[PDB]
Paper text:
The [name] of [name]-[name]-2 ([name], also referred to as 3-chymotrypsin-like protease or 3CLpro) is responsible for the majority of nsp processing, cleaving at 11 conserved sites along the polyprotein including self-excision of [name] by autolytic cleavage of its own N-terminal and C-terminal autoprocessing sites. [name]-[name]-2 [name] is a functional homodimer of two symmetrically disposed protomers that are each 306 residues in length (33.8 kDa). The active site of [name] features a Cys145-His41 catalytic dyad, which orchestrates nucleophilic attack at the carbonyl carbon of the invariant P1 glutamine and the formation of an acyl enzyme intermediate central to efficient peptide cleavage. Using C-terminally substituted [name] chimeras, we have determined X-ray crystallographic structures of [name] in complex with 10 of its 11 viral cleavage sites, bound at full occupancy intermolecularly in trans, within the active site of either the native enzyme and/or a catalytic mutant ([name]).
Cleavage site C8 has crystallized with the same approximate unit cell dimensions and relative [name] dimer orientation in the crystal lattice as that of the earlier structure for C5; however, the C8 crystallographic data is defined by the space group P212121 with four protomer molecules in the asymmetric unit (ASU) compared to space group C2 and two molecules for C5. C4, C6 (form 1 - see below for definition) and C12 also share a general relative disposition of [name] dimers in the crystal packing but C4 and C6 have higher symmetry belonging to space group P22121 with three molecules in the ASU with the symmetry generated dimer contributing its C-terminus to one of the active sites of the non-crystallographic dimer. Using C4 TSAVLQ as an example, the substrate adopts the same extended β-strand-like conformation as C5 SGVTFQ, with the P1-P4 backbone, in particular, superposing near perfectly and maintaining the common hydrogen bonds for P1 and P3 residues. P2(Leu) induces a distinct active site conformation in the S2 subsite with Met49 and Gln189 (and surrounding loops) changing orientation to create a deeper binding pocket in which the isobutyl side chain is buried, sandwiched between Met165 and Met49. Gln189 is more extended and forms a single hydrogen bond between side chain Oε1 and main chain NH of P2(Leu), an interaction common to all Leu/Val P2 substrates. In the canonical form 1 binding pose (C4 for example), the P3 position of substrate points outwards towards the solvent, away from the binding groove. When the cleavage site region binds in a standard extended conformation (form 1 structures), the P4 residue occupies the complementary shallow and hydrophobic S4 binding pocket (side chains of Met165, Leu167, Pro168, and Gln192) which are remarkably closely positioned in all captured structures and in part influenced by the rigid Pro168 main chain conformation which packs directly against the Leu167 side chain.
Residue numbers in the entry:
A (entry chain B): 1 to 302
B (entry chain A): 1 to 46, 52 to 302
Write the structure that this text describes.
Amino acid sequence: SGFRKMAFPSGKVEGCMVQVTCGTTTLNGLWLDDVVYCPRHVICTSEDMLNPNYEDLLIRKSNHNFLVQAGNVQLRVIGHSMQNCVLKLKVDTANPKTPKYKFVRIQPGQTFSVLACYNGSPSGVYQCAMRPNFTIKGSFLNGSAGSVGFNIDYDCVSFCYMHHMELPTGVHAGTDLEGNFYGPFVDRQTAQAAGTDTTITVNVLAWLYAAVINGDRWFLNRFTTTLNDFNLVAMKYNYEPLTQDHVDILGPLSAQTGIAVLDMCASLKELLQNGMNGRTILGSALLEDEFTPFDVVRQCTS
Amino acid sequence: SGFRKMAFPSGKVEGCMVQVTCGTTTLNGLWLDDVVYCPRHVICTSPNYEDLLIRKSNHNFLVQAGNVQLRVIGHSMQNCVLKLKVDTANPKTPKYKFVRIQPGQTFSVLACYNGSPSGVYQCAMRPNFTIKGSFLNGSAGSVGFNIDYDCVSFCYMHHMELPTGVHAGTDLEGNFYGPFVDRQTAQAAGTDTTITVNVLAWLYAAVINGDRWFLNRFTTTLNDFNLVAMKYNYEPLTQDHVDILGPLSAQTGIAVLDMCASLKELLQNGMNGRTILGSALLEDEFTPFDVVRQCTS
Ligand code: NA
């Protein structure tokens, strides 16, 4: 038993991380086959960081200006191109450690593993959720841009996040691997703010199921609610609406525990209206919402 | 900015994980050079281990590295772990050493099932010597480790779960952490305590990340803090702990006994419904080294 923030094994991604240096700027790149993917702000010079013209900066640059290093080996850049906010550097060597992979743009409330990287060398791995306001609560210092987020399904690495920047509140913003930012953010050092976040309701319910699986059952009761009645309460407390598909996805956890999803919604309703009253759930005094139903299933179910 | 429970990259360990089978019992093994390390209980079948090992033969041992069949050349006892010599050295063997960690120290765990890694998480050895981890059946043989400059220091191998849901295991020398044995005895973990020096490091991490509502003007003596900490089941803070917190004290400009008065206030009065680094409880699974490694800022 037990329950912990559990990331996917990072070995398949570690073999793809490279260092990309353009002038005085060094960050991380993702080397898949013969293409290196990295944030386009690597070409950004101190001359204009408020609102640079990335098309102008890319034209003022050639293949030889991009220093790409994989460990001790220098990769030769053969071509470069710009896709939205991501730079693509074609190299003469295909990464022999390229795993089976695909690019995926995830939905808010989904989680992924982040391989934090500096100078092309992985430093650590941890779990992150795509917040409803399209930020993530990561751990990133200067030089960590180009670190990627991912999920691994049947040995296929689904890349979903590339880190770009940190917002004034300390939350983090990035793009998918096609260069499209999550949220309304832009890759410029301007005064930007995320919108007000909301709690991922289906994830809280999954975490409650994980609590029951681990013998934490004090919050349960005999009451049941309708989907409509619960979603009225969820609105009052700044919780995301719960859909019928959310109920279906929680089905395996309901099977494991014996607690109907609408029964667990009644428990969550009472938790929101009364609080924990000094008690804890899975070693936490707050309702955790960064665990998806699939995360609980993969960790707490054989 | 930001502070999260971060595990070490698991790739160097992933290439050493194998599956070891004995009759109907199957668990995980660690393949370094021509030796596979596995829990001794696998030889036991649904306990005088020495006799069962004598009765056991090499062909009774089935070791699979993915789908590569490893031929067992011999088997020897390593305390509560079993060393299976195989005819092939692991080509992916990293630079490594076997290290026994102290209570309060942290490490990353690669949870594995049938020789295949499922997930990586960061755990801390408890003062009781139990580890609070996430293990299902078949996870025995999963290992805990730290990585420093591409050298893997293996410190833990998982053996079993205690009745309270906490986990017990050995180091890679087969010596069990705590008084636990790999038998069916009614062993139970001793009363656990909170790792005081880790909480202080985590408070320093919060200050570095701008979370500092808990700072106050008071400074406590070491003994006055320890008497309060004892009342709340906190481990005593030693002068060596104070010395270890020196670098974080210098970076933040907050004396250690100044921070201790903050912790004393939090213990006696609670958090008043506020959070520190996203948590409404006091966190004790981050060493001072863990803070410097991630909050370099
Ligand atoms: Na103080």
